[PDB]
Design an enzyme around this catalytic site. Sequence first.
Site, PDB file in Angstrom:
ATOM      1  N   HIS A   1      -7.047  -0.803   1.894  1.00 42.51           N
ATOM      2  CA  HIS A   1      -7.290   0.317   2.799  1.00 42.51           C
ATOM      3  C   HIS A   1      -8.749   0.422   3.156  1.00 42.51           C
ATOM      4  CE1 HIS A   1      -4.455   1.660  -0.377  1.00 42.51           C
ATOM      5  NE2 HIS A   1      -3.598   1.538   0.679  1.00 42.51           N
TER       6      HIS A   1
ATOM      7  N   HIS B   1     -11.378   3.256   3.428  1.00 40.34           N
ATOM      8  CA  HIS B   1     -11.672   4.597   2.953  1.00 40.34           C
ATOM      9  C   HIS B   1     -12.757   5.217   3.773  1.00 40.34           C
ATOM     10  CE1 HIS B   1      -9.357   4.495  -1.033  1.00 40.34           C
ATOM     11  NE2 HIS B   1      -9.120   3.305  -0.504  1.00 40.34           N
TER      12      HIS B   1
ATOM     13  N   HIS C   1      -8.526   7.689   1.893  1.00 43.65           N
ATOM     14  CA  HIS C   1      -8.275   6.788   3.038  1.00 43.65           C
ATOM     15  C   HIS C   1      -8.855   7.378   4.309  1.00 43.65           C
ATOM     16  CE1 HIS C   1      -4.439   5.159   0.846  1.00 43.65           C
ATOM     17  NE2 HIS C   1      -5.562   4.989   0.137  1.00 43.65           N
TER      18      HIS C   1
ATOM     19  N   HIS D   1      -0.072   9.359   4.735  1.00 43.84           N
ATOM     20  CA  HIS D   1      -0.160   7.958   4.394  1.00 43.84           C
ATOM     21  C   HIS D   1       1.089   7.216   4.811  1.00 43.84           C
ATOM     22  CE1 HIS D   1      -1.363   4.456   2.185  1.00 43.84           C
ATOM     23  NE2 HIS D   1      -0.149   4.416   1.659  1.00 43.84           N
TER      24      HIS D   1
ATOM     25  N   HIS E   1      -2.436   6.770   8.031  1.00 39.56           N
ATOM     26  CA  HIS E   1      -3.869   6.937   8.176  1.00 39.56           C
ATOM     27  C   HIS E   1      -4.414   5.754   8.997  1.00 39.56           C
ATOM     28  CE1 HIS E   1      -3.446   8.890   3.942  1.00 39.56           C
ATOM     29  NE2 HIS E   1      -3.431   9.818   4.888  1.00 39.56           N
TER      30      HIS E   1
ATOM     31  N   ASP F   1      -4.907   2.639   6.826  1.00 38.43           N
ATOM     32  CA  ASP F   1      -3.776   2.091   6.085  1.00 38.43           C
ATOM     33  C   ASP F   1      -3.430   0.670   6.498  1.00 38.43           C
ATOM     34  OD1 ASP F   1      -3.584   4.385   4.606  1.00 38.43           O
ATOM     35  OD2 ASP F   1      -1.890   5.236   5.752  1.00 38.43           O
TER      36      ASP F   1
ATOM     37  N   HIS G   1      -6.926  -2.373  -4.295  1.00 35.68           N
ATOM     38  CA  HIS G   1      -6.467  -1.526  -5.385  1.00 35.68           C
ATOM     39  C   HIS G   1      -5.757  -2.283  -6.480  1.00 35.68           C
ATOM     40  CE1 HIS G   1      -7.232   2.583  -3.708  1.00 35.68           C
ATOM     41  NE2 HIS G   1      -7.296   1.871  -2.560  1.00 35.68           N
TER      42      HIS G   1
ATOM     43  N   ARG H   1      -9.381   1.357  -8.099  1.00 31.82           N
ATOM     44  CA  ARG H   1     -10.071   0.575  -7.112  1.00 31.82           C
ATOM     45  C   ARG H   1     -10.698  -0.605  -7.810  1.00 31.82           C
ATOM     46  NH1 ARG H   1     -12.272   5.669  -3.306  1.00 31.82           N
ATOM     47  NH2 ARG H   1     -10.235   6.671  -3.556  1.00 31.82           N
TER      48      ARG H   1
HETATM   49 CU   LIG Z   1      -7.487   2.383  -0.732  1.00 28.91          CU
HETATM   50 ZN   LIG Z   2      -3.431   6.006   3.521  1.00 25.64          ZN
END
Ligand SMILES: [Cu+2]
Ligand SMILES: [Zn+2]
Lengths: 153, 153
Positions: A46, A48, A63, A71, A80, A83, A120, A143
Amino acid sequence: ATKAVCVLKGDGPVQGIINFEQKESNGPVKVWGSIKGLTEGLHGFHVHEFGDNTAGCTSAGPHFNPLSRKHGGPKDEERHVGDLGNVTADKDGVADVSIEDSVISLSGDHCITGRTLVVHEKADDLGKGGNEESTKTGNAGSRLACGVIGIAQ
Amino acid sequence: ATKAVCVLKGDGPVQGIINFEQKESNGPVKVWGSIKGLTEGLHGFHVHEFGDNTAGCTSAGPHFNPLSRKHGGPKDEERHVGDLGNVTADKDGVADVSIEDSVISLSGDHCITGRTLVVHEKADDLGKGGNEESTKTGNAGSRLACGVIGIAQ
Ligand SMILES: [Cu+2]
Ligand SMILES: [Zn+2]
Ligand SMILES: NCCc1ccc(O)c(O)c1
Ligand SMILES: [Cu+2]
Ligand SMILES: [Zn+2]
């Protein structure tokens, strides 16, 4: 074309390099590169909100979500901007990334440059996990590595 | 109003955190923070063109120079947008940074977000060194540490 790049690093073995290219303003963005040091399987992937790595990857915030959506996965309408789904690592711990995305951009209000790309711990359930956290984070966990997305030559 | 941040990493450790704040898009940018692990004396301090750290700080390219000017100090009319002068370290290896600059911005064509901040080996002569390289790099030498400037909370 417009180009961007991200070097992913963290506290453990996960490291990677991701490139972005956008041929046209408001056109799709190609995302490609490699990530190593991963456990086999899916890892949430993602953009962020913040390009802040002060205290590591946590400093990047949630995100990137300029449209205040829930999400989802990259192929969902309800997602998002940040995403990008999952990358998938084989037994050697390597994920080959090759994504095209039409929601992120390298200019304007959907611009991801100056924000953080994160890989992640766990799979992103793409908002289909059936708990509250599924429609916020996808249950992708911690993360492992991140970097600030920068303007490229 | 608008905020940005950069985590500088290089060998030493030369490490640092630098914060940026701009109360309005038409206004000056406050730059403040700390860098440690430096040799005593001046170290050139610039925003470089690219936010690419693929192969290290070299990947960032030349000083950020949207107006195609020659190198100078931050007080000079004739400067690169990215010319923030020098930081100065004591014997303790620490430079305290506290700059206000009117030429850099956190929006618009002079926006430094998504680009690389670099601290250099040696002093920047602010274009007053009287050789050709003075008007390009300030003779500040190699790149000790760098990071991509990111959007902050
Ligand atoms: Cu992420
Ligand atoms: Zn998301
Ligand atoms: N087929 C070339 C891959 C590619 C390159 C740039 C793009 O913007 C894109 O959407 C796709
Ligand atoms: Cu420099
Ligand atoms: Zn310069």
